[PDB]
C-alpha cells in the first residue's frame, strides 16, 4: 500500500490536525484539483457543503485495491497518509465528474 487511512470514518471539521493539508471541497469540485505532497504527509479532504462527497482511487493506484474513502457530510473530512511517491489520481465516487490527484515527491 502506498497509502494509510488514519480514519476509516469521516470525522469533524473542527477536528482536523493542526497545520493539515487541505482539500476543501465545495460546489461540486476539489478546489485544489492537483495537489503536491512529500512521502510521509497526510491530506484531508473536508466537505464543505450539503451534498455528500469521497474520494476514490481505482484499483492498482493507492494499493492491489480500489481505495473508496467513506462519504462525507457537510463539515466532515477524511485523511489518507501517502507513503510513496507518484501521482495518484481520484474522483468521486457518485459524482465521477470530479476528479483530483495527489503528487507525492
Ligand atoms: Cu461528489
Not at 497526510?42 to 473508496?68: P, S, Y
Not at 462525507?72 to 468521486?92: I, N, R, V
Amino acid at each position: 500500500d502506498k497509502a494509510t487511512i488514519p480514519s476509516e470514518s469521516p470525522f469533524a471539521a473542527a477536528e482536523v490536525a493542526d497545520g493539515a493539508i487541505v482539500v476543501d471541497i465545495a460546489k461540486m469540485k476539489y478546489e485544489t484539483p492537483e495537489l503536491h505532497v512529500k512521502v510521509g504527509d497526510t491530506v484531508t479532504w473536508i466537505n464543505r457543503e450539503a451534498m455528500g462527497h469521497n474520494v476514490h482511487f481505482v484499483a492498482g493506484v493507492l494499493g492491489e485495491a480500489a481505495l473508496k474513502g467513506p462519504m462525507m457530510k457537510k463539515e466532515q473530512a477524511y485523511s489518507l497518509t501517502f507513503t510513496e511517491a507518484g501521482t495518484y489520481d481520484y474522483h468521486c465516487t457518485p459524482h465521477p465528474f470530479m476528479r483530483g490527484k495527489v503528487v507525492v515527491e
